[PDB]
Design a protein around this ligand. Structure first.
Ligand SMILES: O=C(NO)c1cccc(C(=O)NO)c1
Ligand code: NA
Ligand code: NA
Ligand code: NA
Ligand SMILES: [Zn+2]
Ligand SMILES: [Zn+2]
Ligand SMILES: [Zn+2]
Ligand SMILES: [Zn+2]
Ligand SMILES: [Zn+2]
Ligand SMILES: [Zn+2]
Ligand SMILES: [Zn+2]
Ligand SMILES: [Zn+2]
Ligand SMILES: [Zn+2]
Ligand SMILES: [Zn+2]
Ligand SMILES: [Zn+2]
Ligand SMILES: [Zn+2]
Ligand SMILES: [Zn+2]
Ligand SMILES: [Zn+2]
Lengths: 174, 174, 174, 174, 174, 174
């Protein structure tokens, strides 16, 4: 059945949107995992925990806004299993920041391919949606993650436990 | 002779803007007509009337923003007759909502064609103007009209006059 | 079917009211065109543009009030095409003021004939509606447009470009 | 290694907490799916949508509190796949409420089993944690969903689309 | 070596961004020269001076935003000499406005080619960046400078010294 | 033509002012370059970045105040190219601070030469302008840069990246 609102909305776009939803939920789950790793009594970096929890909720928001878009265009949401993150133990603050950087670039890659698909399907509403709500947000996230990684390395992480403690206090704790 | 401001603005784009201006004014007129139909003593659904009156003033703003665009880019406004709406009697709250859904999808198609023209002529300023001020606005309006049609049908409109009364009070009143 | 509210409302009055609605919508379109003429980069008189845009919105209000009247008396609104204005290029500040003066006296003449009809058909509610909401408004607008024409001429418009510039600042910019 | 903070915390309890964490995230996902079903243009019950979205966010908060508890007691969080919900189409407001009632009773059964485990292992901290933060919350949610199912049924849902519209307005649009 | 943040950022885009930075700094320098020309005791048009000083600071801001973009995408900033402006003596208010209009259309052309490059390299983040922060700003500036040129000519500049004096007071003195 | 305001202002002084203007603009540009070096994702010292960006805007004010001086005394501004800075890559917080110290002592030497010129030409207005707005500014800036260099070296910069991180946080960040 075709939705009464659907217009210029290609089935491949609809499917790409469903895959992006699962990917955002996945990213949120990875960040949830990292957050409570820093909450462990044998890690105990509360500002790393808080930073990654904040990222988790932002990713959930990303997924919900894609779900809204799907219904706005008259597509149909099909949710899939949310796979568990690849690690249970994230080793260190630097390691988590590096894993997060890798994650955000993979999510960025998927958004860029979604945008190319919108361009190729002459769907300028979908292209502007990705441009407006996702692309610069990804670029900021990756730059910020790059910055943190750089500082942690220069301070002597992951070896120096002083480095991660001070970075938690002075960069991530306001 | 060429406007001192004109730059990268194709004659076809200038012509299409003039057509969109007339379409927007025509939409305003359709909504004005619907609004005062619901103001009749034998229809008397005041929130339907206010809903379409609001839409009608918004369409006039859409027209005026395009006329400003025409002047910003160095084009020349040529106005045309505004054709009267296709009905005098809009029959029911449900029928008018369906007629509005159809209208908004017609205007959306015209905007997508305009955006495609801008992209074909490598006019990114006009393409972004269309994306930023019109395309998501159309998607939102189409989605809301669909929502309203769905609710009125499910409530038993247009047979059950109880349904249009209660929809006027509880969704359009607010 | 007669309207359950119709009382002392002649068929001729009803049709004259439909004609006046179209005429007010026409005046509104004329003023809209004048306004965006003065917004052109090669005219660039922002307070003339503002002045005419205000008149255009006022004419729309005049039309909607007559549509409301039509329904209050149980007449039936029939809208017609809105004819495009007579000019696309309004030439100058003084020319547009002269054109607006001509238009307003023509609209006034139609209202006077509308009032004469109402008196002929012994419809004092319609007669008072016209006297109250339209007649002194037309007299005021005509007097104001006369004042503007007089000052523009005395300052040396249309020949003197300094004239329209300073009039735009000191009279139309408050 | 044994956590330096671990005390009176049985391995079975630790594992049962990891299961409960997965179950609460699962319930969050079910409610997320229900929410955006009601956002569909062909369902369009915004207060049903808002209600289930609020339950969704609350379940994720339930999950996070259990993750906090695991770390507090020196257990170790192991996340698992979050299984997608059992439907993609939730049929109606009444059917979604009924599915939620059934979900909440299953979540409750697993919390009662978790409490029984805590008592069996003579873990009063965990027993009281469950009583304080989950048991009455489940009982209130189950009671409210039963109230909602009862009202929807007596109003004539799911047959009467009027019933669900008014329930959405008058009970969930609080 | 490659930046840890760089993704989908073509070396051609990187180099065009370095060029655009130098061009913005150049525009800034042109407007600075214009400003203090009007501050001369034998020119003494204080609002022309303020108007151009404000544009000079805006251009510097445009340049720094491009420097920020370069680093966000992981390109590398290379500054070049900032070439002195084409004139030391800007002759008159109208001449400076004509020169500014010419410069802004040149800056605009360079931005349109930047956008075309970003579209060619399938870089929708860069494309949206230019659309969002530069394209309508250029169109607005070009339209405003056109308006100023038109009014100055119409008032009798450059010949009439009264004209530039009064324009300075009534238009540029807001 | 001699300016109607010129009095006791030697052509050598006028020429030296034009050179100081260019030197100040040059200093602004060096600081702009340094600022965005510390904004790179592989450097990422945000308060180093803000510190030098502030110095950049300050140098620009210095240039502008000299340009106003040139006009007040009836001299004529002649702008020259602004040479790009001597480096693209500023290496480290410590290296930049040492380079800034060298730059400020260079600008101070030029101002002392300017002041000598004014005293040699019996231009006490220009001598006092230089004393009041520049000479103590330079001494303060040189003192501050020395202080900063001293602390970075004592903390173990530029080897210990911990030192630049902590200096950026505790000295440069309020
Ligand atoms: O964005 C485009 N070009 O820049 C584009 C997108 C889809 C189709 C086509 C095409 O094949 N037109 O003929 C072009
Ligand atoms: Na009267
Ligand atoms: Na208890
Ligand atoms: Na865009
Ligand atoms: Zn995301
Ligand atoms: Zn992300
Ligand atoms: Zn394209
Ligand atoms: Zn519209
Ligand atoms: Zn519309
Ligand atoms: Zn009127
Ligand atoms: Zn009028
Ligand atoms: Zn729960
Ligand atoms: Zn629950
Ligand atoms: Zn610029
Ligand atoms: Zn500019
Ligand atoms: Zn200085
Ligand atoms: Zn300095
Ligand atoms: Zn001496």
């Amino acid at each position: 059945s075709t939705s009464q609102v659907r217009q210029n909305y290609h089935q491949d776009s609809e499917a790409a949107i469903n895959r992006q939803i699962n990917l955002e939920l996945y990213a949120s789950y990875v960040y949830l995992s990292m957050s409570y790793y820093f909450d462990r009594d044998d890690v105990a970096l509360k500002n790393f925990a808080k930073y990654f929890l904040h990222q988790s909720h932002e990713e959930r928001e990303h997924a919900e806004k894609l779900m809204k878009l799907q219904n706005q265009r008259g597509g149909r949401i099909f949710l899939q299993d949310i796979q568990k993150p690849d690690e249970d133990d994230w080793e260190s603050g630097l390691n988590a920041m590096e894993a997060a950087l890798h994650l955000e670039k993979n999510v960025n890659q998927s958004l860029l391919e979604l945008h190319k698909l919108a361009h190729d399907k002459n769907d300028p509403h979908l292209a502007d949606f990705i441009e407006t709500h996702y692309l610069n947000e990804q670029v900021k996230a990756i730059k910020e993650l790059g910055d943190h990684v750089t500082n942690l390395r220069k301070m002597g992480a992951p070896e120096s436990g002083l480095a991660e403690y001070l970075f938690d206090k002075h960069t991530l704790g306001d």
